[PDB]
């Protein structure tokens, strides 16, 4: 059995973050004003049900800005620029419509918009708009590449947005430059394979133009489709994210990526959830520290699963389950880095009727709503898809984060205390059920009631997701299903007393990305580590190696041997072309100092140590009783 401990009197602080952030995490890729809320739905007031009743936030939108770009007239004085007057006119028309849409104004408190451009025709590669002109492709001293695209974006923001309600739509919280650009530039079928660094330069130019018109706006990039750093023996890292940080990092307010699991790509299962995404995120942070001297806030503006083998099929509950299980696991991992994550948005749209293709009968593959007669036909009124089960599972969850421990790296856990209520969340990265033994420490009182919520798959492949919700008299043991999540809600007679603190601090090494040779010591240094009397620690070894090569180096920390566990977070990456993941290594706190030397020695040749970082967990008192 796996032992899962909730220390509900011990605050878990990370930076200045001590609380669950519902807007940052419990959200979807929608806006309050899309017209799809207001027709063809079984529920008459769907905003009240989804946004208000479930307390769900928004959002992200790229379609309105695309429509304006594709239809705006060209400046007669400046070939390749949007006409400022016509741009102001189109934006004013849209503003007037927002101003008159008074029914949506009370929902602005649920909205913090991520604005982004779709790749085309915003990227100035010669693609013409519906008006027959292309954004300027110049790259001169006075007109650096992207000047016209940037001016369009800055003017759009200035002209369309107001300050809420009858003054116009609130300004976006975040402006991403461009969606998944290297997919179109380099990786898609028949891509032109034009310059990669030119796209990075373009980001600095866009940021400068947006800020010329809108001085306080936050700009970010590069909104990566598939951040796959280990490919070509880390040549992909070196050509892409490394260069983006070197070229544009200083000009970005935030970094942004997309993270998708591949549960079914020609029958293969290639996951990011677990150790792989830990390696991706650690590498961005570590190289940002080396080059920029600071970790940049990270946005994940689309995440969950891409379901290739089901993307030419009609809707099913099973396809929704594939998305659900990736969402829950990735969310837990983003919650662990809440101090350096500014926004994480599951890729689920409200309705996306525009994505229905009548030639094939295929609807959009990531919808909160589906028509009642799907999958047989795209007819009938809209009802919730199975993706609503995510928001049902996470309903009410809020409060001050408290310490949890689960002695199986395939089991992730977290917990939040909201007055009398405690939410204990447990997620399974393993591909079988896991029996859990639960301990709740730090109070002398038993809970008044326990509500168990368990989201799992019934019936195997092509089965259905089930959200079981029930009251329990006690919960000392619980079997968490394959890739499942539970949210256990404890209700107490009186407010829970939080009287200790565990402060987590993450430390980076002085260097990174070292080639592995057999028998050759690799030395990393992690310095200025602050210790207290009582604490715990985890060393984080990012390894990128071909299959068959050892993931069990000899590890010395300050000259002392430290064992590496056989088990790490998530799957062994069998169907991936190589292993890329962080191996988390508990380390005796007494071995650590302020300046630390971490030595690795492998028995075999090949691959890299991508990063070595360390989490320190410092206690306010002897909370373990050692
Ligand atoms: O499209 C017009 C429409 O856009 C709407 O806004 C879009 C904008 O923000 C939300 C909407 O979707 C986003 O784009 C994503 C979306 O189109 C999904 C599909 O639902 O696709 C995602 O990209 C996919 C596609 O291209 C890159 C990525 O993967 C690709 O698949 C590949 C496989 O085919 C292959 O076998 O394997 C490789 C890996 O090796 C890939 O997996 C492909 O599926 C998009 O990110 C944003 O564009 C707007 O709201 C509307 O008004 C209207 O403008
Ligand atoms: Ca990309
Ligand atoms: Ca990449």
Author numbering: 21 to 646
Paper text:
of the GAL residues in the −1 subsite. with the GAL residue in the −1 subsite was identical. classic CH–π interaction with the GAL residue in this subsite. pocket, at the base of which is a serine residue (S326). residue (T82) in the place of the phenylalanine residue (F77).
determined the three-dimensional structures of these four agarases. initiated by GH86 or GH16B, which generates NAOS. depolymerized by GH86, and systematically saccharified by the exo-acting GH117B and GH2C enzymes. exo-acting β-d-galactosidases, while GH117A and GH117B are α-1,3-L-neoagarooligosaccharide hydrolases.
